[model samples]
Target: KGLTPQSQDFSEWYLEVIQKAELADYGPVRGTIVVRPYGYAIWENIQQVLDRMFKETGHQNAYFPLFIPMSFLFSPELAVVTHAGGEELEEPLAVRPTSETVIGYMWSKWIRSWRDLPQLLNQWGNVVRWEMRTRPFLRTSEFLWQEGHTAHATREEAEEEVRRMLSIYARLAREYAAIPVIEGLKTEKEKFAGAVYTTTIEALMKDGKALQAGTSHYLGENFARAFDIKFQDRDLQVKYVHTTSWGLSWRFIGAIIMTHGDDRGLVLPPRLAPIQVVIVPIYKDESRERVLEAAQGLRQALLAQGLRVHLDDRDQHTPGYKFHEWELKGVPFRVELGPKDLEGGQAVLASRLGGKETLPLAALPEALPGKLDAFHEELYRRALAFREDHTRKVDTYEAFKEAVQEGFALAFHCGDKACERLIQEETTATTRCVPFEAEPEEGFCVRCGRPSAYGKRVVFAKAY
Candidate 1:
């Protein structure tokens, strides 16, 4: 089933794709979601890729409690709590809005010396936030994410860790997810509540809206001072450890949907698609057995080459219906085989991204991997081109406002909170980041027309 045209109604198209593609279902609680098998499979692929990256970067997996005492959480998080024993109880536990408070408490106890300085820990679990309004994977009362917390001996080490993890996140978005991103530092007003500073990777959706894919924060000694995480240094003096935290959530699932999906439905990048290939067997009653035999053989051959391929040989559904179903599900490639094609010793290869071609059955396995790699690269290029086309360099407040309505606006900022807030109030756009790759240039602030405090321009956008 075709979805509502994304150009006409982006929100409606997103919902339709989720439903028709069997990605997720609504939970009994408002603003909650139950990710279906297909959706979770996509998440699993994302996890496998990132988990390896985490281990490569010296992070180790661990678990922490889901419920925190009111004393651990700061003032803002104290309001989100549930009473114990089904009535007024001796204590209340706040379902974790995030793991920082609890994790900080543990690090305080675990850390004792400079030798124990760099504690790199990551945890995959659920967090609850009491949201007034929500959208599926993008915003919900409860969601799944991997939170990474690290302790360093010095401020410099902590800052380096922050940028190091930001680079990893950008790599995940570009190389694995096939979504291009702008990596940069977040403004003070937009940084995490307790963070000294934050860095983020922002990706533009097909509808030209921005999505915050991942973030890494330098906590300095904020949480260390709050929780008393002190260690003995080589000089035999006790000092607070510098800390950092970063996270990537299931909101990435929403990013994938909005970035690549069209009116026909999802067009998943080959890197993250659950099913990279689907083979549909077309046959008449008299030739059914022969066509299915050929399809099975092809499936076996592809699987032997370590490809994710599914043979759709359901007797009840016609081949035409199967093609439409697979296309809607966004399988990157489709192999069509019938009795005639079997006789010809070849199959029709269709790409979700564009055209179709015929190739000898014997050559399919040898050629498929390269094809998938090319598809991933093509998808990344297309998204990057879109972002570049929409981005602009502006020097005036009026032009800045107009530029942000479409995509990214690169403009000089005074780095003042009041000026940032005023710009946001006037136009519903905020600075996405001071892009890491931008070259330094002298310019005037777009908001106040004053000499720029930031030597280079920062990117501003309307974000999800």
Candidate 2:
């Protein structure tokens, strides 16, 4: 399939396409998004996948306050700024951006001994950051997301837990969402404002842009030390608890859109689509009743297969228009029923990813599940292939700069802030991630051309 030339002016294409497709809107406030039904559905899809993963990996769901106490802004100044991302907060009475500091306070009171160590909990909610600049799902001031906060007794345990969360997030994005990412530690400038270290999964959008889809932070004893979240050790000596926190926001929904959407519209992954199959009845007004009866039967059949099925019965809209709208909304598949097809004992099948076929009406009841399974796998294959095609590696400063400016670039580094800034200033691209499989190099800095030792090949790109 041929894609429109949205990349000619990537940002313009993003805004127009998102609105044209109806995932979200600018709404009444600056930097805020009015999540339409379709957009909210996508978020729910993301939440479902991540929530299931979190539980499967030994974490439980919980809820926290929306506003942190006026007194809880006690982390390092840089940490606050890093979390705030240079946004101005008033009385710090603002909405919670990330729940670690506030939630850490709760853990401190709850855990009194080593037995309480390795606490694993998460929450799905909205966060307010007071964004200076706004973009749809990419950089909204307020957005929906889930944050996982955990506590462990040992530094090693806490660090390992942090990495585990990052891995889960990476798996969610690459394996489930069909978008591969670079996993790495955040640079000093890039680390969470107060985090001891922050790890991220960075994905390349279709426009040669980078988006940090998710992150896991090692808080160590910073919050435990400051908040007096101490536990009695095996020796009965009291010690601060070790902590870690990680999050994935609405921007991830945006990543899925940018990474997979075409001019037709959003291309949500099967594992994360709210409406996996849309059923449309195609027939003349007089034959509508006959067609809808069959459509309802097909919808129920697919729903029984555990697919999210939407039956389009809006009398105001035509079947052809409904097809275009659902295609733009990115439903994984569509089933159409007409009098002719009904007479032939068949249901026409259309997939947003590109293909059309027919299923025998008599056999549809049994075949719906297998067809959806095949469609989900098909979407995943295409998305994985797209990301692989867009991601690339470079060895020299010239190559790195050029790549970042024009495409997504992954390059080795000496892990120096100076080196990080040097690349940023030259290309406006930030260090997004360093792979879990990254190799250390003792060689001249890619930017400064000076020799140094640094672990991991970091990914750099100009992001949304």
Candidate 3:
């Protein structure tokens, strides 16, 4: 009843769900928000998933100073990142736009020989970039993220590292976050400024806008040369080490919230839900002992299976209210255990995404794992379908412009910066990506009369 998806505007719905779900709150600062317990818990889960993935691929976690020295910005990235982001810096303490340049300074002092060549370190921290406008997790002045800075002995090794990180990001979204995404290359104009080449994972939102979820950049010797970060080779010659940097941020948290969340509230994927299951025990004092006992036993069994569970036993709130609270919080599964269910030895199970069922108490413990797993997949499928249904493909430049203004358009594009700029000026939409494995077509530029060499189509929309 609060804000139905249809009746609720996107920005309004975003804030309502975020607050009602107990995810985050506007901080005392004008452009900042506090990660509430519920929100932080989700972030912690994201960290655990990605941290393990990074380490499994030979990366280590480390931290860098929050305030980067002003001199650190005089590198390759300085032009791109700064042009896109730096107009806001006003004085002595320059906020960090990105960490690669600063982190490069440290690597210069740390690497002395070829043995230290392939140094891979991942850091979890907050970065600040002055924002002209902010929308909760979508865009803000400050946000939490994980950045990986890796150095390699050879060019091939560095390039491979960039691809490897992009693969990990794709897997994390598809597997753990349960969000379907497109793997592709950002246009030269769109690539991270300091990066030689940037690979990305862009996911479409329910609103038809595209969100850049993660990116892996091949730095070549840009950072190494900037910071004089070179090391002695195996042959004892001084040589610069090639580098790669990548990151995934809390924005992915926002993306999941927008992609699958609904009128009821957030429909958090079970894989990332802090409390995977919430059980509401309903009964008067006479039946409390029996119902609660059953609830506790069920909770323990689920816990033993390495599941996260919460038992709502407070007497003050009505069962209906408890159900609403948990639903708003977007707990994946809710098990309602009352006197009747206890007597029948069956509990009512309601999935957050709109399904209902009953499971015998005896089977409750074993059946939940399957239910949660299915919910995870179901959420992503529905979201992906929603995105596909809204997307349109247009051939002519005029049609492409009209289609994007109305919503979104996927089209064959000429790989020219001038043409892309012209389209963007006439329409706020820009090329999202030239995806891999797209249906091939050797065509002409929809704008100019030039030949279109880039394969695959590019999606255009008003991006976040």
Candidate 4:
């Protein structure tokens, strides 16, 4: 069976590819998914990369409770049952939606002086949001993510931390995930519920909808006041500490899939691919032993190079079947070695993005790293070009409507919640973000002709 064409019905294609490639399946629960080993393997790689990056920037991992007390709008989007252990409880406990209140409560106890001023902590955990609707990796009742919570002595320091974490997310997207993003500030109506301000990295998916990949919030004293996270400063004054929380969730998997997938299936970048290379031995029963030996040798050599390499030597499936399977699973590279290739002293290297080259078997381990890096570059370049092609800058409401239907529409907004709502009601497009580095431009709002609210044009799109 063939997948639904990406252009014909992208939504249907996404659902089909997710299951067909064995990444995930609809869980028995209505709004959940069962991430298979292959899918979780990708997530593990993502976690390792993010943890390393977070640690490099002086953050430490910590844990928080899963159930937050209902007293605490603080409740998880999915509130827990009043009856647990088959008995009624005095107060209801809710799954954690965000960790600010509880973490701040602990900080109030531990942060006594200026010395404990800068607490940089991150937690890799699961969160629950009881969404009425769900998409596999994009949205669900339960999701995996790493949330970073930090407290600082000064508002300046807290703001810096907010931008710093957002920068890390942008780097992860462009460098590792091969998705270029627009680093921007969330509008008042779109900002986090209790945040002083929110910074985001918005990605334009293949379907032209925007996905907020990650968000960092500066909670300048709102949370500190609520939880009594006060500390003695160097000047001997008790002050509410400035706090911030940032998160990058598994919805990133959806971004990666939509940004690079084709009608055939996913096209994963090499840097984040769980299996960078898979070796398929092409042979009949007569030459199976010799071909397997050569293929196994190359796999062992690549493994020695610390590459995630797999050898598909299943006797029941033919080489063609293995190739299709790996291709659908989005392995960045495939090495095909047959008896003829052994005689020729080289093998064919096929890239998921498209292109093949013959590499000498002797160049096995040493040559792949560079080629893999090049593959990453190629993938990023392709995505950036596609985004650039789809993006449009328009000044009129008529043009804005057409532009957002295809991609991001860079247009001036009146910065009025009422006007923003009207636009959404009409076009189903919302303000994504006001880009950080956009030049100061004077113009009227695209929909209402009111003076531009932000100095620069805001990115408006149909969003996830």
- Of the two candidates 2 and 3, the one with more favorable TM-score, higher being better, is 3
Model 3, 336-414: lDDT tens digits are 9889877988989988887788779888788889888998888878877877786888878888877775556877768
Model 4 scores a C-alpha lDDT of 0.90
Flag regions of model 1 displaced more than 4 Å: 74-81
Candidate 2 lDDT by residue in tens digits, 228-334: 89999999899988888899888888888888888777777877888877888888878888888888887877777777789998888888889988887888878
Off by over 4 Å in 4: 74-76
lDDT, candidate 3, equals 0.83
Best by TM-score: 4
lDDT of each: 0.88, 0.79, 0.83, 0.90
Clashing pairs in 1: none
Superior by lDDT: candidate 1 or candidate 2: 1
Report the lDDT tens digits of candidate 1 across residue range 153-269.
999999999998888988889988889998888888899989988999999998877899999999999999999999999999999999999999999989988988878888888
Off by more than 4 A, model 2: 1-5, 74-92, 365-368, 439-442
RMSD (Å) per prediction: 1.7, 4.4, 4.0, 1.4
User: How does candidate 2 fare on TM-score?
Assistant: 0.90
RMSD of 3: 4.0
Count of backbone clashes, every candidate in sequence: 0, 3, 0, 0
User: Which numbered prediction scores highest in lDDT against the true structure?
Assistant: 4
Task: Give the clashing residue pairs of candidate 4, or none.
Answer: none
